[PDB]
Every structure is written in structure tokens, then in C-alpha cells.
Amino acid sequence: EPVGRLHIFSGAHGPEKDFPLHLGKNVVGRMPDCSVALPFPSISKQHAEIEILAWDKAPILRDCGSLNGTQILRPPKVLSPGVSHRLRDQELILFADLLCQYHRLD
Amino acid sequence: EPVGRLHIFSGAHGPEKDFPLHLGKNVVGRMPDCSVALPFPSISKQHAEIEILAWDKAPILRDCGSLNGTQILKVLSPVSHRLRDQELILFADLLCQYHRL
């Protein structure tokens, strides 16, 4: 039933984990209510949003005004708050210092 | 036999892959004759070098005057950068991670 997966690689925070992604707004943040809950001090309560709409295959990543930022690698830059970045399958992203990878599902 | 490793994250180009690093000079480049052969159009024939002197000493990464560059997540100039464990490296647009063993 999910349309994507976000994989968080193992690091200082702990072991690897996967998070299902659904159509609509997938909020990344430290809060337990978040679609992608990352309860780590470097992560803001509402850190970022991955919006997946049925009418476009590419998710839209936006930073939500986080302290430590959201970084993409195509090209390497910290995202300006609110500006859309369109994600490609298998794209790697950093939330603060946490490395993640987006996967499109069949 | 190997003293470190470089992990290349999955993409369109294929699954995740690990490359062993050995004592001495480990050349990273496009050609199959490189210690770390990364056959991507964006990577130079001789792209970068990871020199490992001892098991217990931090490797030195040097860019070899490649076209698309090498970055630490700090842009590396044709500079001797000392690698930390779990350091993320971009060779051109290709992300990879250095690991101690």
C-alpha cells in the first residue's frame, strides 16, 4: 500500500530503518506524530516534508524551516525553506547529519 | 588483506557495492586498471587517490585534477585531506562512504 520508502542508514542515532511513504504529505520530524519520526536532537519538530501526488511520479521535498537544514546532492546544496526539490528514484538526502535514500515502489 | 573500505550507494547504475582499500596508493578512476574502478562517464580516468600508510593512521584523500571534482560533505583542490571514519565523499556526482575495519 505505500508508494515509496525512505531508508535511513545506520549512524550515531542508531541502526538502519525504513519508513513507508504514502500519497499526500509525509512530514519528517522529531515528533512521534510525524510520518517519518526521527526522535534525534539534531532534527527539528517539523523538519521537512515529502509530498507525493498521484499526478506526478516525482515526490516534492521541501525544508520546513529547520535549524540544521535539509541537504540535497544534485547538486550539493542546503534547501531554501519551502522551495520545491523534485526527487528521483534512489536519490540520497541529508536531514541534519542523517543520511537517507528515497525509493519508488512498484 | 584490506585495511579500509569504500562503500558506493545504490542508484540507477546498480546495487550498493563495497571496494577494498589496501596499504599504499588506492587510485580511484574510470578505467578498469584503477584500484577502485568506478566506470561512470562523469568520473575521470585517474580521478582521486586514497593513500593508506598504516592500519592505525587516518588515510589521505587527494583529488588528481579531475574535471568534475571531489567533495567532502569542503571542495577538494588538486589538498591532502585526512579521512575520518564514516566520511561521506562525492566523486563527481557519485556518493560514497569511507569505512575503517
Curated annotation (Swiss-Prot), chain A:
Outcome following mutation: residue 30 to A: Abrogates binding to the MRE11 complex and to CHEK2
Protein modification: Phosphorylated upon exposure to ionizing radiation (IR), ultraviolet radiation (UV), and hydroxyurea (HU). Phosphorylation in response to IR requires ATM, NBN, and possibly CHEK2. Also phosphorylated during the G2/M phase of the cell cycle and during activation of the mitotic spindle checkpoint. Ubiquitinated by RNF4, leading to proteasomal degradation; undergoes 'Lys-48'-linked polyubiquitination.
Phosphoserine carried by residues: 80
Top-rank taxon, per record: Eukaryota
Compartment annotation: Nucleus; Chromosome
Residue ranges of every copy of the FHA domain listed in the record: 26-77
Annotated region described as Interaction with CHEK2, given as residue ranges: 1-106
Tissue localization of expression: Highly expressed in testis.
Swiss-Prot/TrEMBL domain comment: Tandemly repeated BRCT domains are characteristic of proteins involved in DNA damage signaling. In MDC1, these repeats are required for localization to chromatin which flanks sites of DNA damage marked by 'Ser-139' phosphorylation of H2AX.
Cited function: Histone reader protein required for checkpoint-mediated cell cycle arrest in response to DNA damage within both the S phase and G2/M phases of the cell cycle. Specifically recognizes and binds histone H2AX phosphorylated at 'Ser-139', a marker of DNA damage, serving as a scaffold for the recruitment of DNA repair and signal transduction proteins to discrete foci of DNA damage sites. Also required for downstream events subsequent to the recruitment of these proteins. These include phosphorylation and activation of the ATM, CHEK1 and CHEK2 kinases, and stabilization of TP53/p53 and apoptosis.
Subunit annotation: Homodimer. Interacts with H2AX, which requires phosphorylation of H2AX on 'Ser-139'. Interacts with the MRN complex, composed of MRE11, RAD50, and NBN. Interacts with CHEK2, which requires ATM-mediated phosphorylation of 'Thr-68' within the FHA domain of CHEK2. Interacts constitutively with the BRCA1-BARD1 complex, SMC1A and TP53BP1. Interacts with ATM and FANCD2, and these interactions are reduced upon DNA damage. Also interacts with the PRKDC complex, composed of XRCC6/KU70, XRCC5/KU80 and PRKDC/XRCC7.
Protein known as: Mediator of DNA damage checkpoint protein 1
Organismal lineage: Eukaryota, Metazoa, Chordata, Craniata, Vertebrata
Gene name linked to the record: MDC1
